[PDB]
Amino acid sequence: WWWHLRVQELGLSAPLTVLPTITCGHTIEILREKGFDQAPVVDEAGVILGMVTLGNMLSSLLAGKVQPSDQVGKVIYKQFKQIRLTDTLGRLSHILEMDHFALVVHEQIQYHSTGKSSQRQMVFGVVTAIDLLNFVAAQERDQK
Amino acid sequence: WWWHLRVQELGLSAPLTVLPTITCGHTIEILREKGFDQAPVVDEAGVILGMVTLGNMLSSLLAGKVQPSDQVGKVIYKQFKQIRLTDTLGRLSHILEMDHFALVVHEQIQYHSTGKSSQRQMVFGVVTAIDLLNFVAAQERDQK
Amino acid sequence: WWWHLRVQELGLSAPLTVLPTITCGHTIEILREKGFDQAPVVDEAGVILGMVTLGNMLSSLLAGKVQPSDQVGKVIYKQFKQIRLTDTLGRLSHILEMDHFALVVHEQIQYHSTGKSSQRQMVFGVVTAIDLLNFVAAQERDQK
Amino acid sequence: WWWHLRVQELGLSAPLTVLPTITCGHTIEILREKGFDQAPVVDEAGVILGMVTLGNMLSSLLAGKVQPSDQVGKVIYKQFKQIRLTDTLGRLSHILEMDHFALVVHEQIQYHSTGKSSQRQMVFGVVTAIDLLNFVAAQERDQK
Amino acid sequence: WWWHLRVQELGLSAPLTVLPTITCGHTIEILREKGFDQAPVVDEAGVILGMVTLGNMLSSLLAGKVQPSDQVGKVIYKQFKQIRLTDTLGRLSHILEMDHFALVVHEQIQYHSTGKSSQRQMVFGVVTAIDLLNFVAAQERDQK
Amino acid sequence: WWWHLRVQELGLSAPLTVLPTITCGHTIEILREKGFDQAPVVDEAGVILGMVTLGNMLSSLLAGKVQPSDQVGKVIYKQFKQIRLTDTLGRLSHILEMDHFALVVHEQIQYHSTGKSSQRQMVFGVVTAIDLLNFVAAQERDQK
Amino acid sequence: WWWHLRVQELGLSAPLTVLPTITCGHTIEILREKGFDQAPVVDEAGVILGMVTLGNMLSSLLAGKVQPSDQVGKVIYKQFKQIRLTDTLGRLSHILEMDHFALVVHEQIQYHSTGKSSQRQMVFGVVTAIDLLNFVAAQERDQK
Amino acid sequence: WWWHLRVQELGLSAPLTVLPTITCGHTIEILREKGFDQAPVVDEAGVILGMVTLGNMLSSLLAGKVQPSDQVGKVIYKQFKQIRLTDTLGRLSHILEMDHFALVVHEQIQYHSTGKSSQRQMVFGVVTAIDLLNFVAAQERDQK
Amino acid sequence: WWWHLRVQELGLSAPLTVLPTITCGHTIEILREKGFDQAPVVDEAGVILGMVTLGNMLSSLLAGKVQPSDQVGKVIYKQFKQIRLTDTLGRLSHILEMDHFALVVHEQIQYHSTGKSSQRQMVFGVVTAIDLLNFVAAQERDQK
Amino acid sequence: WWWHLRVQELGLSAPLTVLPTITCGHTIEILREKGFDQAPVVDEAGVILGMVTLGNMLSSLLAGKVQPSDQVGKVIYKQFKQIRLTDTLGRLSHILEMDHFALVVHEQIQYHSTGKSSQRQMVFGVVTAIDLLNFVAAQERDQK
Ligand SMILES: C[S@@+](CC[C@H](N)C(=O)[O-])C[C@H]1O[C@@H](n2cnc3c(N)ncnc32)[C@H](O)[C@@H]1O
Ligand SMILES: C[S@@+](CC[C@H](N)C(=O)[O-])C[C@H]1O[C@@H](n2cnc3c(N)ncnc32)[C@H](O)[C@@H]1O
Ligand SMILES: C[S@@+](CC[C@H](N)C(=O)[O-])C[C@H]1O[C@@H](n2cnc3c(N)ncnc32)[C@H](O)[C@@H]1O
Ligand SMILES: C[S@@+](CC[C@H](N)C(=O)[O-])C[C@H]1O[C@@H](n2cnc3c(N)ncnc32)[C@H](O)[C@@H]1O
Ligand SMILES: C[S@@+](CC[C@H](N)C(=O)[O-])C[C@H]1O[C@@H](n2cnc3c(N)ncnc32)[C@H](O)[C@@H]1O
Ligand SMILES: C[S@@+](CC[C@H](N)C(=O)[O-])C[C@H]1O[C@@H](n2cnc3c(N)ncnc32)[C@H](O)[C@@H]1O
Ligand SMILES: C[S@@+](CC[C@H](N)C(=O)[O-])C[C@H]1O[C@@H](n2cnc3c(N)ncnc32)[C@H](O)[C@@H]1O
Ligand SMILES: C[S@@+](CC[C@H](N)C(=O)[O-])C[C@H]1O[C@@H](n2cnc3c(N)ncnc32)[C@H](O)[C@@H]1O
Ligand SMILES: C[S@@+](CC[C@H](N)C(=O)[O-])C[C@H]1O[C@@H](n2cnc3c(N)ncnc32)[C@H](O)[C@@H]1O
Ligand SMILES: C[S@@+](CC[C@H](N)C(=O)[O-])C[C@H]1O[C@@H](n2cnc3c(N)ncnc32)[C@H](O)[C@@H]1O
Incomplete structure (x- = not known):
């Protein structure tokens, strides 16, 4: 029955995100002390630009490419099956199987000085x- | 009974906002073509930094401080009452009782290169x- | 400079009004899709007999006096700052300065069988x- | 140059119309004391249901159809090159070039209890x- | 029965007539506030030499032949059909059913020491x- | 350099594990409020008889076998590339990549009344x- | 310097233990042929419940309380001083210096059907x- | 009953003994691999001049007197509850009640060139x- | 029946040997006062380098090899079928039967500074x- | 030189003897604690009848012919070499070489009232x- 439900109901108390410049080892702590596993990577403007997860994080460090002292901008997860908040749980239940997580986007439309519209996507x-x-x-x- | 209803359930399709540099005359068009009258004034990073409303803008143009060609940045509405999307209808309905509109915000905690938390309020x-x-x-x- | 202009100069195209028997929510839907905020309450003869506005309507609905399914007549916002089309923009602009909306009216005088004069006011x-x-x-x- | 100008500018302070039941001898009197030439005929609801002019009337009286005590409603003039106030003076100029009068109208969109639109023509x-x-x-x- | 009625017995209100030198508009605005439409043009005494109406003026002015500032002499409408006061109402019907007005003339036969019969057709x-x-x-x- | 390190050094403060009879929703709550992801399923004797992980368990709810009120015993998950505590990080770095976790085994050799040895695996x-x-x-x- | 070292580095490969049911003499034989001196006594569930030593054996066997053919649970040594593996080597130092042997333990906490928790102590x-x-x-x- | 028996009947294993200058660790390993707990310290002639025990050896390193690589003559134990092979099992069992071991000695009456009697004690x-x-x-x- | 018995169960009386440097005459003296038929001969280290018997003496004195003042080391008897303290009494009795004396030796396995295994033999x-x-x-x- | 010597200088103090009825072990014990090996067996008057040693007696006991409890008379060793005291030490030494003992006999030369000389040879x-x-x-x- 639950697949009837919708994304917004799910209590996404998840304001936490990272800059690409955050040290890899530090994120490792933050997620674990929080018990978390994956963190969004955005700019200081908040624009969605990637992901970080242990699965690629462990794989990256064990690949020898980076150190834990490295920045997550170079090991950024990006292949998230991101979904929209307006959608239902069935899609969530669908997508959240092949991997444990997916981003929910919020869209923001700004208008320039000359009235020209623009789009910003938010987490x-x-x-x-x-x-x-x-x-x-x-x-x-x-x-x- | 509806005042029990949860705020996010209210089906807000509201991504449109403005930069402070938008011309007042064009600003009226965008709201009037949309049938709107009030729109968020934010930066390119989506910073909650004010409002614009019918009374804010009608008084400003009638006061002569802004010409129709003037920018909205001079007369950004600021005295808005604000609620959070996680709140309930009853207070929002309470909130809407003595104003033409109400702002709903959201939060997004970025983390520095040094892993320090940084909280950003988002429209x-x-x-x-x-x-x-x-x-x-x-x-x-x-x-x- | 514009405040010196005649009220008729503006060209308030839409003559859209309602009867005092339409369901409250139905009024709201009609105005909102069109983006309107108010609707004159007149008889089938068109005689100006009141107004309805969302500020009243939101207050009325939250007052508990009317369901959205209730008729619009019981919340008739018959009070309004009313001006004539033959008047100046500035005073109407003055009128709109401290109101959520304003009303203009169209006069009409009918003469019966005995030729005794009468008065009517259309929108x-x-x-x-x-x-x-x-x-x-x-x-x-x-x-x- | 004036022919380009809008109808509404021409100061049409003309709210006077009559019911069809008014007698012939009174219609002539009012138009004469007013110095008028013709008078619109409407119902009590303002529905534009006719006309009466000196040419219509003089032909009517001299044909013997109406005694001076008879109603103008029996020989109610109804033909006219009617125009709407949104138009330009040249068309009014065009229409008045061959007719002995011009008729301008107005619209009102009433809405019923069921939300059904109803555009009403008005004088x-x-x-x-x-x-x-x-x-x-x-x-x-x-x-x- | 009225067709027999003597034109003299009608009791015309009064004559109002101007000289051709004065402009149309000044005559035009005067006649209309009296309600009039057509005005004679005579000599210093009242001899038939001119006739103006709105119908020909509107036709001529919109034709561009003369301005409202042009003299009333150029908008002459003397091509009327003319009647004598000794005639009856029926003759007026045979006149006025087509034209918008009828001219009635009269003789001011004053007698002087000039030694010859005098005739001056008054209006x-x-x-x-x-x-x-x-x-x-x-x-x-x-x-x- | 880290693969030089040995499994024993890691310090797994991980005494927590479950019975198969534990409620499905309670299981997820237990890990989640503590922030964990998966906990061993053992008997009251500590026998390593199963495992519970979100990836199967989210699939398990979507498979329909378990509601959150159900027990994990009916959906006991039993595959794991379990490692041995005496190994190095090289094996951990190797093994712990293709899945998010792996069991570490302690062992116990109990001796019967006749002196017959009996190995018991411990978590x-x-x-x-x-x-x-x-x-x-x-x-x-x-x-x- | 070594006293600082961690206990788990010490290669504590002692999975062997006994049930109380086995006779005394065989246990002494068992530790003798494999070369040990003392063996832990646990239940079939592996719960730490006692110990057995040479002094625990010889004194009791000389006391006449047990024959060499008597069951080992009769003389279950339990007055050991006990340590946890997470401690340091110096903690072993000030344990064996006065005791003739040392016991170390491992902990395990199980969670029930109702989600309640209980710890198990494992050698x-x-x-x-x-x-x-x-x-x-x-x-x-x-x-x- | 066995305490009535005779010491010589016991059937010792062998005399595994060492010289004082042997490294502490090598004795440590030897008693380990042999499973032994102690080893007598004698000269190359076999004179009973010392002993090395677990309690002596553990106290020796932990007191800091000898490194494991140091020689055992530094900590040579000699406080054994020495017994003779001719003695009784019960006394030996009594002798073993507090010590973790008991030295059994042997005699040899060696005479000289002049016939002088002399006793050489043997392990x-x-x-x-x-x-x-x-x-x-x-x-x-x-x-x- | 006694032939089944054992060395250790049979037991010795007492050991007495001598260095070879004793004179022949005193060797007789010690044996004759003891009534001994023979004597072992070892060094002060107890190494079994020889022995002496009655048959050795009777041959030696009558061959002129040694005077009573001469040392036994001149004619130190070396033939002996050595036996161990583990052997059945029947063999001991058998092995003694054809000879006129027999010797049992005791093993002594001592270890050097380098822990090298070495077995000495003791009388x-x-x-x-x-x-x-x-x-x-x-x-x-x-x-x- | 000693071969010149005689039994008169020998100082053989060996008069002890046994009767044949005496038990072997009884003779064995007596000979052993005085330290002899061979024992003479004579009549009550000292007349030579028997001789025993341990070498045959052990051999006979090992042969199973007699028990140690048997009488000494049935284990006789009279196949010795017998000598007379008048013989020189060289011949004495010569004759004892190929055995472990030799017999010397007594032949005193005085008689009594029996009336006839004879010989009663004592040992x-x-x-x-x-x-x-x-x-x-x-x-x-x-x-x-
Ligand atoms: C405690 S962690 C458990 C670890 C598990 N692997 C997972 O990702 O769900 C899960 C909770 O953390 C919260 N969470 C996940 N990502 C987050 C993020 N980037 N910022 C803040 N909260 C987050 C989610 O709301 C979720 O309920
Ligand atoms: C149809 S307009 C009616 C006029 C009304 N006074 C107003 O502008 O808010 C209102 C609808 O537009 C949406 N809306 C209001 N402001 C908006 C904005 N700035 N950007 C996007 N949507 C907006 C609101 O959700 C509301 O449902
Ligand atoms: C497209 S709507 C924009 C949305 C806004 N609520 C509003 O109505 O002004 C713009 C026009 O609708 C007109 N309007 C507002 N209320 C009206 C009513 N009750 N009947 C007819 N026109 C109306 C206004 O005068 C305005 O010019
Ligand atoms: C003052 S009369 C004089 C002109 C001429 N007698 C005529 O009626 O056409 C004309 C003026 O009266 C006004 N008028 C004409 N008919 C009217 C009517 N039926 N009701 C009210 N005003 C009228 C018109 O605005 C026009 O400007
Ligand atoms: C409104 S006028 C009659 C309508 C006519 N179509 C007109 O406007 O001239 C009313 C009265 O004015 C009088 N009248 C008309 N023209 C006049 C003129 N030029 N001088 C004096 N009276 C005039 C007529 O006698 C008539 O009774
Ligand atoms: C905060 S959790 C984050 C989620 C992680 N994937 C996990 O294993 O649960 C990480 C820590 O939880 C601990 N942990 C994992 N499973 C546990 C269990 N079953 N019992 C006790 N601790 C556990 C691990 O030691 C790890 O360091
Ligand atoms: C080789 S034996 C040497 C004799 C020693 N004195 C003793 O306590 O038995 C000692 C080794 O056996 C191991 N050990 C001790 N008790 C054991 C047990 N109950 N089961 C298996 N191994 C044990 C210890 O770790 C130690 O390293
Ligand atoms: C085979 S080990 C069995 C291991 C057991 N932990 C122990 O040492 O007693 C025990 C045997 O070794 C013998 N033994 C002990 N110390 C010895 C030593 N220093 N030299 C030779 N044998 C020894 C004991 O007499 C005992 O019979
Ligand atoms: C007591 S004498 C018995 C009678 C006779 N003298 C003989 O030797 O057979 C023998 C005993 O002395 C002991 N014995 C023999 N030779 C010995 C020696 N060289 N040193 C110490 N004891 C010896 C033997 O144990 C034996 O039990
Ligand atoms: C000390 S024992 C040991 C010598 C010899 N191997 C033996 O056992 O007969 C020998 C001495 O005892 C003496 N002796 C031998 N037989 C004896 C006997 N039957 N009675 C008394 N003395 C005897 C001999 O004189 C000899 O000096």
Whole structure:
């Protein structure tokens, strides 16, 4: 039944993200002390530009390309199956199987001095099935 | 009953915002062509830095401080009441009671090259009672 | 300079109004898709008998007096700052300065079988600020 | 140059119209004391249901169809080269070139309880070249 | 029955007539506030030499032949058909059913020491169907 | 250099594990609030009889066998490239890449009444990349 | 210098243990032929519940409480001083210097069907100074 | 019962003994691989001049007096509860009650060139209770 | 039955040997006072370098090889069928039977500074049938 | 030189003898603690009838012919070499060489009232090479 549900309901309390210049070893700590596993990589403007995960992180360091002291900009995960918040859990349940996570985007349309429109994409969160499992374990009392 | 409803459920399709350098005259067009009157004023990084409304802009143009060719950066509406998307309708409905509009924000905590957290507030969108009315009109069908 | 202009100069094209029996939400949907905010409440004869505005409507709905399914007549915003089309832009601009909207009316005198005179008032149009702001933006391309 | 100008500029302070039930002897009187030539005929709802002119009337009286005590509604004039106030003076000029009068109208879009649109034609006023001649001496001080 | 009624018995209001030198517009604005449409042009005494109307002026002015600032002499409408006061209402019907007005003349036969018979055809006035309609309305009161 | 390091040094403070009867949703909660990802499934005697990981378990919920209220015993996950505690980081670096984790085994040789030996495998912990990733940063101060 | 060292480096390959049910004499034989002196006593679940030593044996066997053919659980040594593997070598130093043998333990906490937690204590390896002396004579080759 | 028996019956294994100058670690390894707990210290002539024990040796390094590479004559133990082969098992068992081992000695009456009598003490071997317990483990099947 | 018995169970009386540097006359003296038939000859280190018997003396004195003042090392007897202290009494009795004396030796495996294994041999004692004949009367009360 | 010596100087103090009925072990014990090997067996008057040694007695006991409890008379060794005291030491020494003992007999030459001379040969004693060895050792002191 849960696949009926929608992305926004899932409580993406995930404001955390990184710059590409963050030291690899530091991110390793932050995720673990938080218990997290993957962190979004954006610019200081917040523009979505990549990902970082242990799976590529361990693979990269063990590949010998970088040190833990290196910056994540050079080991940036980018192949995320990113989804939109407006979508349903079925798509989430679909996508979140081949890998543990996927980005949810929020779109931002700015207009220039001359009224010319522009588009900015923002991070709504970084979700995993735990959020799905956590949410599905409780909310079924209300809108099942 | 609807005041219990959760804010993110309100179907905000509101990515449009403006740079402060946009000309007032063009600004009116974009809102009026959209049927809008108020729009977020943000930087190129999406920094929540003010507003623009009907009363803000009508008073400003009638006061003569901004010509129609003037930029909105001079008269950016600032006294907006603001809510968070994780909040509830009842307070937002309360919030909308004494204003024409309300701002919803979001947060995104970037982490430095040194791994230090840095919190950035990000625009979620712009809500007027139409959004509440439009959704509660839909909730007439969804309360099943 | 524009405030000296005649009210009729603006050209408030749309004469869109409602009867006091249409469902509250239905009014809201019609205005919102078109982006409107208000609608004159007149009889089938067209006699100006009131107004309805979202600021009243949001307050009315949140007051609990009307469901969205309720009729619009019971929340008739019959009070309005009303001006005549034969009047000056500045005073209407003055009128809109501290109001969410303004009303203009069209007079009409009928003579019965005995020729005794009568008076009727039709709606010339409904004006908000963005009428003027767009109009002065357009008109200053011709007369300025 | 004036023929290019908009209809509404011509100061059409002409709200007077009659019910069809008014007698012949009173219609002539009012138009005579007003110095008028013709008078619109509408219902109590303002529906544009006819006309009456000296040419229509004189032909009617001299044909014997209406006694002076008879109603103008029996011989209600209804033909006219009707125009709408959004148009230009040249078309008004064009229409008045061969008719003995010109008719201008106005619109009102009422909406029912079911949200169904209803465009209602409404009288704006009666115009003759006097309105042109009176006002042509005026705009040659404003736009000329 | 009224067709028998004597033209003299109608009781024209009065003659109003100007000299050809004065401009059209000044005559035009005067006649209209009296409600008039057509005005004679005579010599220093009242001899028939000219005739002006709105119908020909509007036709001529929009044709561009003369301006409203042009003298009233160039808008002459003397091609009228003319009647004598000794005739009856029926003759007016045979006149006014087509034209917009009728001319009635009169003789001011003053006698002097010049030694010859004198004849000076005066203008008796300007009569329209309103006079006819007023006269038949009045005669229906006399014949009561 | 780190592959020189030995498995024993890593310090897996990982005594936590589960029974097969543990509730599915409770299982995910337990790891999540603590921030873990997977915990061994053993009996009350500590026998290494299973494993629970989100990737199978998210698939397990999507397979429909388990609701969050279900037990993990019916979806007990039992494949793991388990490593031995005496090895080096080279094996860990090798083994721990193709999956996110691997069991580390302690062993126990119990002797019967007749002196017959009996080997019993024990869980020394549950390791992922962080354990070494944190450790490699630390071990550059002690052994290298 | 070695006293600083970590216990787990000491090659504590002592998975062997006994059930209480086995006779005393065989256990003494078992440790004798394999060369040990003392062996840990646990249940079939591997729960640490006792010990057996030469003094625990000879004194009891000379006390007459047990025949050599008597069961070993009768003389289960339990007054050992106990340490955890996570400690340092100097902690072993001030343990074996007065005790004739040393016990080390490993911990394991299991989580129930209801999610409640319970710890299990598991033997790591029965160690005496020879391991230390063997290890310290060996590890200095790694350092130097 | 066995305490009535005779020491010589026990059947010692062998006299594995060392010189004082032997390295501490080599004795440590030798007793390890042999499983032994101690070894007598004698000269090349076999004179009973010392002993080396686990408790002596563990205390020796941990007191810092000898490195593992140092020679054992520095810590030469001689406080053994020495016994003679001719003595009884019960006394030996009593003798082993507090010491972890008991030296068994042997005599040799060597005469000189002049016939002067002299006694040369000889090491018969080394015994722990494990000898006795194993010894009684079989003797109860033949001499009982 | 006694032939089944063992060296150690039979037991020695006492060991007495001498250096070869003793004179022949005193060798007779010590044996004759003891009634001994023979004597082992070793160094002060106890190495079994020879022995002396009655048959050695009778041949030696009557061959003129040694005077009583001469040393036995001149004619130190060397023939002897050496036996070990592990051997069945029947063999001992057999092995003694054809000879006139027999010797049992005791092993002594000592280790050097470099821990190199080395086995020296030690004299256990001299045995004649008296050792058998006296003890056989005793073990018939112990084994029988 | 000693071959000149005689039994009269020999000092054979060997008068002890046994009866044939005495038990072998009883004779064995007596001979052993005095330290002899061979024992004379004579009648109650001292007349020569028997002789025994250990060499045959052990051999006979090992042959199974007699037990140690058997009488000494059945284990006789009379196949000795017998000598007379009048014979020189050289012949004495010569004759004892190829054995372990020799017999010397007593032939006193006085008689009694029986009326006839005869011979009742008593044993003079039991000499060994040790006697000679003791004798030659002593006589070397006497002659020098
Ligand atoms: C505690 S971690 C558990 C580790 C597991 N491998 C995973 O990624 O889900 C999961 C929780 O952390 C939160 N989280 C994941 N990524 C995050 C991020 N980049 N910033 C802040 N929170 C995040 C999610 O809301 C999720 O509920
Ligand atoms: C249809 S307009 C009606 C006029 C109304 N007074 C207003 O502008 O907010 C309102 C709708 O547009 C959306 N909206 C308002 N401001 C917006 C903005 N700045 N960018 C994008 N959408 C916006 C809101 O969600 C609301 O549902
Ligand atoms: C496209 S709408 C823009 C959205 C905004 N709510 C509004 O109505 O102004 C612009 C025009 O709608 C007109 N308008 C507003 N209320 C009206 C009403 N009740 N009937 C007809 N026109 C109306 C305004 O005068 C304005 O010129
Ligand atoms: C003052 S009369 C004089 C001109 C001429 N008598 C005629 O009626 O055409 C004409 C003026 O009266 C006004 N008028 C004409 N008919 C009208 C009517 N039916 N109701 C109100 N005003 C009217 C027109 O604006 C026009 O400017
Ligand atoms: C409004 S006018 C009659 C309508 C006619 N179409 C006109 O406007 O001239 C009303 C009265 O004015 C009078 N009248 C018309 N023209 C006149 C003139 N030129 N001088 C004096 N009276 C005039 C007529 O007698 C008529 O009774
Ligand atoms: C904060 S969790 C992050 C998620 C990680 N993939 C995991 O294994 O759960 C990382 C730490 O949790 C610890 N851990 C993992 N499984 C555990 C378990 N079953 N019991 C106790 N600790 C565990 C590991 O030692 C690791 O250092
Ligand atoms: C080689 S034996 C030497 C004799 C020693 N005195 C002792 O305590 O047994 C000692 C070795 O056996 C190992 N050991 C001790 N107890 C053991 C047990 N119960 N099972 C398996 N190994 C054990 C220890 O780690 C130590 O390294
Ligand atoms: C075979 S080891 C068995 C291992 C056991 N941990 C121990 O040392 O007792 C035990 C045997 O070795 C013998 N032994 C002990 N120390 C000895 C030594 N220094 N030289 C020769 N044998 C020794 C003991 O007499 C005992 O019978
Ligand atoms: C007591 S004498 C018995 C009678 C006779 N003298 C003989 O030797 O057979 C023999 C005993 O002395 C002991 N013995 C023999 N030669 C010895 C020697 N060289 N040193 C010490 N004891 C010896 C033997 O153990 C034997 O039990
Ligand atoms: C000391 S024992 C040992 C010598 C010899 N191997 C033996 O066993 O007969 C020998 C001495 O005892 C003495 N002797 C031998 N037989 C004897 C006997 N039957 N009675 C008394 N003395 C005897 C001899 O004189 C000799 O000096």
